Amino acid sequence: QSACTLQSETHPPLTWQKCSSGGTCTQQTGSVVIDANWRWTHATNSSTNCYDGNTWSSTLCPDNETCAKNCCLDGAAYASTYGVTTSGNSLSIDFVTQSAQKNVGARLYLMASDTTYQEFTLLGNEFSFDVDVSQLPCGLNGALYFVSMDADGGVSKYPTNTAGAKYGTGYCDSQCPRDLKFINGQANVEGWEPSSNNANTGIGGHGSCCSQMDIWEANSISEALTPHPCTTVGQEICEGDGCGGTYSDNRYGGTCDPDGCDWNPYRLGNTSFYGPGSSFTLDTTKKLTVVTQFETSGAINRYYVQNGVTFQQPNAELGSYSGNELNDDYCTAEEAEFGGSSFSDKGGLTQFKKATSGGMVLVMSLWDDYYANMLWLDSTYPTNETSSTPGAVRGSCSTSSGVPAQVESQSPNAKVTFSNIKFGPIGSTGNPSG
Template sequence: MEFARGSLTLLLLSSVAPPVASQQAGSLTPEAHPPLWSLDCTARGCWWERGSVVLDANWRWLQKDGKNCYKDGDWDPAVCSDPIQCAKNCAAEGADYAATYGISVNRWQDALTLKFVTQGEYGSNVGSRVYFMDSDETYKIFKLKNREFSLDVDVSKLPCGVNGAVYFVEMDKRGHWNGRSNTAGATYGTGYCDAQCPHDVKFIKGAANSKDWDPKTATGRYGACCAEMDIWEANSQSTAYTPHPCTQPGLTKCDGVTCGDADQRYDGICDKDGCDYNSYRLGDRDYYGPGPGFTVDTSKPFSVVTQFDGTDSGDLAEIKRFYVQGGQVVPNSESSILGRNSGNSVTDSLCAKQKTKFGDLDDFTRKGGLAEMGAALDRGMVLVLSLWDDAAVNMLWLDSAYPTDQPKTTPGVLRGPCPGGKQSTPEYLRSTYPDAQVEFSYIKVGTINSTLPYNRRLGGSYV
């Protein structure tokens, strides 16, 4: 993705604490992770494995003795006089996933639904972000080089300007739990990072990000950088998958030029632009959209399959994409805007051609390209599932014309059919489409060509 996910917020009445990250485990509200099963596959077949999801700590109530540690966009200096003391004082509380955050699983525990706007007892929640776990204390670490990841998606209720995202980031398995300034850990969704080096992460490696905190933007001095592989960023109108390599392993607490902020975007340690494969942007405007006139009909569910081709010991060479809908395998669209025989997958060669064609700086190659992305996949990454709107640029980078100061006829500017303007602003979307939602189901990982559409509800048969 191209911009930070800072627009994901919980809007509560003034008498209740806004959501924030914290590092101590609370005791006022029990934390119960919604169960979510996944499939592990080989050439011999697929087997169900029990897992669960946990809400990101940034959404949770942060309190000390029942009083807010963070209110009206700012820290309470009485309990957060310095970053470490703040982390030791404040506790994250458990979440009511369905009633407050609009997060639910179906009765078979193989499908996750994220709702856009949820009216709770104390106010409205907008969007959410959850992580996949393999125990109540640890995130599941996926190692995907020379493997395949797939899932079913239903984006039929996602309008322009909203993003139902599935991606991997190189988070710590325990959320940087250390038993001292962070006793919440993965159990309460701590430790987030991504390639945008977000500054809205309120605790980084056991310390509050309260230094130079700006209550207007809800950001602190430090950012949280790590490699990111965007499997699926999409609504019903447009989609992209994008590798974002970083030159440092794991979570880096960045400051200054290391973060690559503002006019130093390309001087940081992460490739913030990435190499995106967006079918619309690459020339096929009839490939993805709602209705039978599109190759992939987003008015109906379908499977998304991503293959990370390479070898167990060698570099990542290619990231392939195909879909399965109506029992038919659908190859990815061709990158026709780059010329004949340019391919339909992410390779170092395609990325270089795309950057040249669109007049973009090739930071992907500078940051190590697929080899560096493959190294992160080899080390292991955490699965993230989220639903969000974009207060920064209204999701124009995904589904409309961006940048806005260039003609739409400029190659690479049109990324989707959405009109942009007021209709893509968070204010308009939240009032017009509060019932928007996305469903993710049948999460599968395995050897290349081992994951097929699998329906547990039909007795465990392949369909």
């Protein structure tokens, strides 16, 4: 797709810290850009929509190639249309914003410049950030993660994509998302199936896969840390159901692991660690600091800080595994106790190390789940399972919670705030910022 300028594209600024082993942290200046799927897509020579509701213009978009040549992406009014605002080192995203249209959530990327994505090499480093999840009830997910996206949004590989990173193109993740309107410089109109439960989305014949590091997926009830390997580290297109993931009939038929080696404290047995109120170790009605460390062995460590007190990831006992570190032993034990083979089939942490050794793009979003109502995160799932089944209970939300239409009308004012992002070698982000 190309880019049009009926609406100016001004990326909201966002500062973060880059720290060194020497003990100092220096301020960096970046900005955020909203994903292409959220933008107005119209004809290059007029205001005629190429996509409206959940269907494509059959004349402007008779196929993927022609559609890409005839259509462009436009600018976004971040605050008034998407409810996305920043202030210094802080970023806030509102759940539902009502303007000339109704908007739900947003997916944003951190930029190095006005035309490129900031890449982060996680291996050997740690990532810290503060978060306020107090306004996120059951069914919502304020996410912060990394994906192996190209820094230019794909422009160099796909010449027909001239909008690039400036317009948020090139997304990919371990679900090999088929809901993307533009993949590899082409539209996704061929094989498009509108959603039976969502008036603004659909499923195309193509998906976009790549490694994904889910550092933070949570609401005020539950939180999870999950690495997802793919046999092909970087962004790569897939065909229909061969994609696997959430948008396909066969979830495990693709090249990526849609489940991952997840770590949710509640699911592991500690139901008193994270929750709303002073009865939990970490009170989700108050802001907290989350630190994630990627050691060279390929294992992942985690600690939290709230009101000056530090808490390491709680100890978990799963099979012959005991500890608080996400490593090969934990992931093997989880597959044994909870079931599954997706993570190990895709190479596990060894294959995942290939992704963290390379560049990854930072993504921040707020979303509701039209496929599983976020039950996999904060409730009992599958809903037919009981508490006797190992790993079924992931949170205290009712199995009837998370219906999109319901949460959108009952909690329109929900929101999430990410702030004070710090990155640098292991053991350095706790030092004085600059």
